[PDB]
Scaffold this active site. Structure first.
Site, PDB file in Angstrom:
ATOM      1  N   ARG A   1      72.236  -9.877  33.018  1.00 24.66           N
ATOM      2  CA  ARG A   1      73.650  -9.628  32.734  1.00 24.66           C
ATOM      3  C   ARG A   1      74.285  -8.789  33.839  1.00 24.66           C
ATOM      4  NH1 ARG A   1      73.504  -5.137  29.137  1.00 24.66           N
ATOM      5  NH2 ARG A   1      74.703  -6.139  27.448  1.00 24.66           N
TER       6      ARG A   1
ATOM      7  N   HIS B   1      62.318   3.372  32.691  1.00 25.43           N
ATOM      8  CA  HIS B   1      62.537   4.532  31.843  1.00 25.43           C
ATOM      9  C   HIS B   1      61.240   5.331  31.805  1.00 25.43           C
ATOM     10  CE1 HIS B   1      66.506   3.727  30.519  1.00 25.43           C
ATOM     11  NE2 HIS B   1      66.211   2.648  29.816  1.00 25.43           N
TER      12      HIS B   1
HETATM   13 ZN   LIG Z   1      67.424   1.110  28.908  1.00 29.81          ZN
END
Ligand SMILES: [Zn+2]
Ligand SMILES: [Ca+2]
Ligand SMILES: [Ca+2]
EC number: 3.4.24.69
Length: 1287
Positions: free
Chosen positions: A369, A233
């Site tokens: 995940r 990010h």
């Molecule tokens: Zn994120």
């Protein structure tokens, strides 16, 4: 390379690598924070992130910040110097782990070198302005207790400790005056609240956490990957590409829908895997265009930047060179900068699709995940990341030295317990939905447990907009993929251009937008009287203060009584589970009920081949009552009728736009431009099909596959609740016994639980396969076809558009307007086949798709079946079926077509199924029963051909017709060319296996041949290479059509069509599957019945029949009379001759009305001797191998056996059956089988051989031989009078 600095929290401030910083959100006021430079442009501040949070919010309360996170609170984290130092050393270790591999080191290098542009949208194009909160941050130089002297520094990332919620890591960007430099191409100082110890936990549905329910399940995350997820990010923010676009917003109009924040495409890109597929190609391109546009602005600035007013000491050239390399712009020999499309593409794709959590996890061999949309579990605390015995820089938790590299055992909660600690639930906060009934009982349901269903507004409608086609116009595809290998081996990805010094003028303009956060109620109460999945799962639990429970099939009782627990397993399972026994019988009982559990769970592998469904988990409806009341009635039946759709909790309203029109640019006189335009319009047309398919996949994944995921999880919970309930009961029953008794009770609680878990795992695998098949089914039958409809409509509109374009340009094209007119016709002809692999490269998804496509039954595009006195299509494509009044239907799936005008069936097929084009490839299968010819009507029978099934469109198509004893298949291509293949059975046989008897037909078509199969055997072949296009999806009319006798009729059953060529093997299997029944059949192939008159036929003596001998109680065997007339076309042996037998049931005095004879039934074989009903007996005491049967009036003599067991020894399809005489039902003493035997007779006058109705032990061994001997004299068939056979 990347250098990770070393330092201790207590080390002295040196104003260089250890400073007193004024964080951006402090607005230049309040205290400073001791910050440490872990690497160039990256700082660590080991303190809680408090910006925008109330001090009391650091304490666990009745509120929550995020509705989808099990939030852990701990205000003391980082409250001491030693704690701060541990944070630092841990961050240092995570960074080393990160750079321990090329990919991670490159992520760090990109971040360090991705310095923010010096300015933002407000800054003039000709200037660099360092005096803004997103570029410069201040450090305090002056002595302690006085902000008298400060210095400015450039920075890229500042990592703080966690905010109120420890496990809620977040990357924040700087907004000023409502705008974000990091979202508009410039980039800006990035911040992050991070916690290394309290990591997330996840468990894969399609997998198993060590396959141990009773044990801890799931895997805990590797904090280094969690950090790299945030660093991604950060990377996006530094390069100014963290743009906002159409987000995925959850529908929340229903109480069962999951509530969550809007999800931006950048978040899904960051995670990688299948998630980018949820972002349509339309939005992919929208975002791409915004970024490119952002970069155009920056490149223009570089060509105009002249000065930095905020800092006279800034070297303009150094930064221009740096920014040029940051954004990969190119510069001519004069210094003119411009965007290179190729380099921009590679940079963009690298940042969005190269660096993803999924890609990084795979490279570092770290388990994570499967998707962003997966249930979130409670976090765990890692004991000591600084202990190399538990976590290393090289391998993280998965240390091969500790044999934990394989299968990610180091992250497995059930295996590596020494590495973590569970968290006190008291400190956890979870958003729950309280579902109250209008009375009032309430059930709390975690928000995570609800169905996530994306709202329609989540998807772009750009496909509905118009497009201008020109000689220019090119395709536009953004591959959500980037070869991680080239990225890792890329030579110019990483900058080699000088990094500017960080010191600059102190910031004086502290203007900045500071986010304000606040908790919301952790519980939302709603009202509903529905008893869906949540209530059903709830009814399967019991309070902690209760230890004595009993199972019940009554959902309502389970909700009402705390000692009652609901079970979706059998009535017998439930009774046994509730059974109380003596100590001496307890171990026996435990073995019984546990074994019963496994059996019940294993029913998840139930097959339903006769309904064309390979797998069905019969108890899902009873377990969850999910979707459309799946707990009522019989689930299997309901599924055969409506399919996957019945399990959906909600049917999504799909966005399927009318594709916008194409505007072709006029190019008068230009021959090339015009031709190029036409081509570009064609290719553009393909982009539309692909983009439409992408729009469908995205919706399917976020509105449908999410619902099926919830169901898979629901079943895992359901099965576990069941095991837990049985475990509770077993413990209770055992503990009622005294210590003395327990000592003598042989029970192993660990073996029990093992047995149960294994049964559950096997069940879960079946349920997973079942549900995935359902999900793909919904995609292919309920979604793709609706898109194909719009796309086909688009093609048509575009077709006329282009031809009309080749019209208005006829001249400027001259002798070509024809060549390209056909070019357009043939192009818009062949449509684009849907391929899921084009829109995603997720292994699980691709495999689901390929599995589906490998199942021949999914090729069924029409399956007419009986339901509620009507014929309906169960293929799942919704064909409209109109059955008119003259058609006779019965529950045996048989339908009759007569000579009446209203005896007809009209089938309007689904026009949106890839059926046509390429080469003609489809199959048709059905059972048929054709009546015998009228002897006095043989000429017309063999002369008049009549159609029975016709499917035409534009004088092209197919039909099944009949001419006497011949059944014909006819094809007619668009040109009128006609080819036929037929099957003709003999009508001169003493005994025909086809006339008036049910037989199975299957016709297959490939580009080369047309084949007709009869009862699985290939009978006829026709080369159809010359045949061109054949329109096969027109209306199908079932009706006798031709010069027929008014008595003419036809029976048909199981009519179905496949959009592919069936193999001889598929056909043989279909034949055996549709031939199967628990009951025996009669000569014609219908179910054998009790109390019905039947003449007897012997497969081993075809031309023979039984007659009661005049002088004795025996059945003599005579030769069948035959057709006597003089026609040369026909011959047969009479069938309505000999005694009239009638089968009577032995058990239940339910009288003698009529009924179905099933295999293994005990019967009495009787017959009519005038006005009396006699019986077939076997004298009990014969010592020879065989003896004549005894035929006499009904009576009971101890000397004769009177009971027969009707059998079926043949494993293959047949209408023959066998009759056995046993000593008695219970014994295994076989007297023999009924057959025919030859005896020699030599009397005073006549000498000869005669055959008699007999019983023989010889047959007993013969019926065992393989293959089954159909010629055996013990094979019989029953022939009742039938209108289809007259003699
Ligand atoms: Zn994120
Ligand atoms: Ca996408
Ligand atoms: Ca209960």
């Amino acid at each position: 390379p990347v250098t990770i600095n070393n330092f201790n929290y207590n080390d002295p401030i040196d104003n260089n690598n250890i400073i007193m910083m004024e964080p951006p959100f402090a607005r230049g006021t309040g205290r400073y924070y001791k910050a440490f430079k872990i690497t160039d442009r990256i700082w660590i501040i080991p303190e809680r992130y408090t910006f925008g949070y109330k001090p009391e919010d650091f304490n666990k309360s009745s509120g929550i910040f995020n509705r989808d996170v099990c939030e852990y609170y701990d205000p003391d984290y980082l409250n001491t110097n030693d704690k701060k130092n541990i944070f630092l050393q841990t961050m240092i270790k995570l960074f080393n782990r990160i750079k321990s591999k090329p990919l991670g080191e490159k992520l760090l290098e990109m971040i360090i070198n991705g310095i923010p542009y010096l300015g933002d949208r407000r800054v003039p194009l000709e200037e660099f302005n360092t005096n803004i909160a997103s570029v410069t941050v201040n450090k305090l130089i002056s002595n302690p207790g006085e902000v008298e002297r400060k210095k400015g520094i450039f920075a890229n990332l500042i990592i703080f400790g966690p905010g109120p919620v420890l496990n809620e890591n977040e990357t924040i960007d700087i907004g000023i005056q409502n705008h974000f430099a990091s979202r508009e191409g410039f980039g800006g100082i990035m911040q992050m609240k991070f916690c290394p110890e309290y990591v997330s936990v996840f468990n894969n549905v399609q997998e198993n956490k060590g396959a141990s329910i009773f044990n801890r399940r799931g895997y805990f995350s590797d904090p280094a990957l969690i950090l790299m997820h945030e660093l991604i990010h950060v990377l996006h923010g530094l390069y100014g590409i963290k743009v906002d676009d159409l987000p995925i917003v959850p529908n929340e109009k229903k109480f069962f829908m999951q509530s969550t924040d809007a999800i931006q495409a950048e978040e899904l890109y960051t995670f990688g895997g299948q998630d980018p597929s949820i972002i349509t190609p339309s939005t992919d391109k929208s975002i791409y265009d915004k970024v490119l546009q952002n970069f155009r602005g920056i490149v223009d600035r570089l060509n105009k930047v002249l000065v930095c007013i905020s800092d006279p000491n800034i070297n303009i050239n150094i930064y221009k060179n740096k920014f040029k390399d940051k954004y990969k712009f190119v510069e001519d020999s004069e210094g003119k900068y411009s965007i290179d499309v190729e380099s921009f593409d590679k940079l963009y794709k690298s940042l969005m699709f190269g660096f993803t959590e999924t890609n990084i996890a795979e490279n570092y061999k770290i388990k994570t995940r499967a998707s962003y949309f997966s249930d979130s579990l409670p976090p765990v605390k890692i004991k000591n990341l600084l202990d190399n015995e538990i976590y290393t820089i090289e391998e993280g938790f998965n240390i091969s030295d500790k044999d934990m590299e394989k299968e990610y055992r180091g992250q497995n909660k059930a295996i590596n317990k020494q590495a973590y600690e569970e968290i006190s639930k008291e400190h956890l906060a979870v958003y729950k939905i309280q579902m109250c009934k209008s009375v009032g009982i309430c059930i709390d349901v975690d928000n995570e447990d609800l169905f996530f269903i994306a709202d329609k507004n989540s998807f772009s409608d750009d496909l509905s907009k118009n497009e201008r086609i020109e000689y220019n116009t090119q395709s536009n595809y953004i591959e959500n993929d980037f070869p991680i290998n080239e990225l890792i081996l890329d030579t110019d990805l990483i900058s080699k251009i000088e990094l500017p010094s960080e010191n600059t003028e102190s910031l004086t303009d502290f203007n900045v937008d500071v986010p304000v956060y606040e908790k919301q109620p952790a519980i939302k109460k709603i009202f509903t009287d529905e008893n869906t999945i949540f209530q059903y799962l709830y009814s399967q639990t019991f309070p902690l203060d209760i230890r004595d429970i009993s199972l019940t099939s009554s959902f309502d009782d389970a909700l009402l009584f705390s000692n009652k627990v609901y079970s979706f397993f059998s009535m017998d399972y439930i009774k046994t589970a509730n059974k109380v026994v003596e100590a001496g019988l307890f171990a026996g009982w435990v073995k019984q009920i546990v074994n019963d559990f496994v059996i019940e769970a294993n029913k998840s592998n139930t097959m339903d081949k006769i309904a064309d469904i390979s797998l069905i988990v019969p108890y899902i409806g009873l377990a969850l009552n999910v979707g459309n009341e799946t707990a009522k009635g019989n689930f299997e039946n309901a599924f055969e009728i409506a399919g996957a759709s019945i399990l959906l909790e909600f049917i999504p309203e799909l966005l399927i736009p009318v594709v916008g029109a194409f505007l072709l640019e006029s190019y008068i006189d230009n021959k090339n431009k015009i031709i190029k335009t036409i081509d570009n319009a064609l290719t553009k047309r393909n982009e539309k099909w692909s983009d439409m398919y992408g729009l469908i996949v995205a919706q399917w994944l976020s509105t449908v596959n999410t619902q099926f995921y919830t169901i898979k999880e629901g079943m895992y919970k359901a099965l576990n609740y069941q095991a837990q309930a049985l475990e509770e009961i077993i413990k209770y029953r055992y503990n009622i016994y005294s210590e003395k008794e327990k000592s003598n009770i042989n029970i192993d609680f660990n073996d029990i639980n093992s047995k149960l878990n294994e049964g559950i795992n096997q069940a879960i695998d079946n349920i997973n396969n079942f549900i995935n098949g359902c999900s793909v089914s919904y995609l292919m039958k309920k979604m793709i076809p609706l898109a194909v409809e719009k796309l086909l409509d688009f093609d048509n509109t575009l077709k006329k558009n282009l031809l009309n374009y080749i019209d208005e340009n006829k001249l400027y094209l001259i002798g070509s307007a024809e060549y390209e007119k056909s070019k357009v016709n043939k192009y818009l002809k062949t449509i684009m086949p849907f391929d899921l692999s084009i829109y995603t490269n997720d292994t699980i998804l691709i495999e689901m798709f390929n599995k589906y496509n490998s199942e021949i039954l999914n090729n069924i595009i029409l399956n007419l079946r009986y339901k509620d006195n009507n014929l309906i299509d169960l293929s799942g494509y919704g064909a409209k079926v109109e059955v008119y009044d003259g058609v006779e239907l019965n529950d045996k799936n048989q339908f009759k077509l007569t000579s009446s005008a209203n005896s007809k069936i009209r089938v309007t097929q689904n026009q949106n199924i890839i059926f046509n084009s390429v080469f003609l490839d489809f199959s048709v299968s059905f059972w048929i029963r054709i009546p015998k010819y009228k002897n006095d009507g043989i000429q017309n029978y063999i002369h008049n051909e009549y159609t029975i099934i016709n499917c035409m469109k534009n004088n092209s198509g197919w039909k099944i017709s009949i001419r006497g004893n011949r059944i014909i298949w006819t094809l007619i291509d668009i040109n009128g060319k006609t080819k036929s293949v037929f099957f003709e059975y003999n009508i001169r046989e003493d005994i025909s296996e086809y006339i008036n008897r049910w037989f199975f037909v299957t016709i297959t078509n490939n580009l080369n041949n047309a084949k007709i199969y009869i009862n699985g055997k290939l009978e006829s072949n026709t080369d159809i290479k010359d045949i061109r296009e054949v329109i096969a999806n027109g209306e199908i009319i079932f009706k006798l059509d031709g010069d027929i006798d008014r008595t003419q009729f036809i029976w048909m059953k199981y009519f179905s069509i496949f959009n592919t060529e069936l193999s001889q093997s598929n056909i043989e299997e279909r034949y055996k599957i549709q031939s199967y029944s628990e009951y025996l059949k009669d000569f014609w192939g219908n179910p054998l019945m009790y109390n019905k008159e039947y003449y007897m036929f012997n497969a081993g003596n075809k031309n023979s029949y039984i007659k009661l001998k005049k002088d004795s109680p025996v059945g003599e065997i005579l030769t069948r009379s035959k057709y006597n007339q003089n026609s040369k076309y026909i011959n047969y042996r009479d069938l309505y001759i000999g005694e009239k037998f009638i089968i009577r049931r032995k058990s239940n005095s339910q009288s003698i009305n009529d009924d179905i004879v099933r295999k293994e039934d005990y019967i009495y074989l009787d017959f009519f001797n005038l006005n009396q009903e006699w019986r077939v007996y076997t004298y009990k005491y014969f010592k020879k191998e065989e003896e004549k049967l005894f035929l006499a009036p009904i009576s009971d003599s101890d000397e004769f056996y009177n009971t027969i067991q009707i059998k079926e020894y043949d494993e293959q399809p047949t209408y023959s059956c066998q009759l056995l005489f046993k000593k008695d039902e219970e014994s295994t003493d076989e007297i023999g089988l009924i057959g025919i035997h030859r005896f020699y007779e030599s009397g005073i006058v006549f000498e000869e051989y005669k055959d008699y109705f007999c019983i023989s032990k010889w047959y007993l061994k013969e019926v065992k031989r393989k293959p089954y001997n159909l010629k055996l004299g013990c094979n019989w068939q029953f022939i009742p009078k039938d209108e289809g056979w007259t003699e």
